[PDB]
A paper describes a structure:
Here we report on seven crystal structures of NP7 at low and high pH and with different heme ligands. The overall fold of NP7 resembles that of other NPs. Eight anti-parallel β-strands (A to H) form a barrel that hosts the heme cofactor including the ligation by the proximal His60 residue. One of the most interesting features of NP7 is its ability to bind to negatively charged membranes.
However, no significant conformational differences were found between the X-ray structures collected at two different pHs (5.8 and 7.8; RMSD = 0.22 Å), even though this might simply arise from the packing of NP7 molecules in the crystal. Overall, these findings suggest that the ill-defined heme density of the unliganded NP7 reflects the movement of the cofactor inside the heme pocket according to the two coordination states. However, packing effects also explain the large structural similarity observed for the different ligand-bound and unbound structures, although such a structural similarity does not permit to rationalize the effect of deletion of the N-terminal residues on the binding affinities of certain ligands nor the pH sensitivity of NP7.
Author numbering: 2 to 185
The structure:
Amino acid sequence: PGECSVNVIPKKNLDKAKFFSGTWYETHYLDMDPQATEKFCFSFAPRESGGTVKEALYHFNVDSKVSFYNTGTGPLESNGAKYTAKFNTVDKKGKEIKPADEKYSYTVTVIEAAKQSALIHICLQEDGKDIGDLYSVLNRNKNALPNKKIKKALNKVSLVLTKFVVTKDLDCKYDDKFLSSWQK
Ligand code: HEM
């Protein structure tokens, strides 16, 4: 029902220092629930050290004009391109406003990365059971189109970019300072 996709393959030999740096913007996304049709914008700043990922997350609800901020922490898998995190809720200043709920986690897989582009998959879980998943194309630049390598990776798993929501058209509002100041 809320079962996460199979055939999500972590990139071989991801350059960690490059991927886990700076800010990434979602440019296209595909929620695997066809009824999940609310428009959102997303950006994040993932960092890694000693086999642990610490990331700052930003979402913006286009419909309601409400933004929310989270941080996530968890171990990086031995393959170096997949991690599972627990998360809390913070305000725009980075201060915790709601503690992590033990029953929830998410698993991010980096499927492909090339130049200024990447393709990721996220699986949300409750008590270790799948509750839903999503694919996202990322770019360093809000308005940029994906590298062909990202399209190749989509093709390998029988997805086509035309099915994704494109957010550059949406009235996105970003908190870039929250992400740029992450772990500063
Ligand atoms: C790229 C496109 C993405 C979209 C469109 C999206 C959309 C959403 C939506 C609609 C919600 C629920 C908001 C609500 O209940 O009002 C949500 C929650 C959440 N998402 Fe995303 N998401 C994306 C990517 C990600 C990624 C890549 C991560 C982790 C790296 C992530 C982590 C979370 C977390 C932790 C929550 C729950 C926050 C809370 O309950 O306080 N999301 N997202």
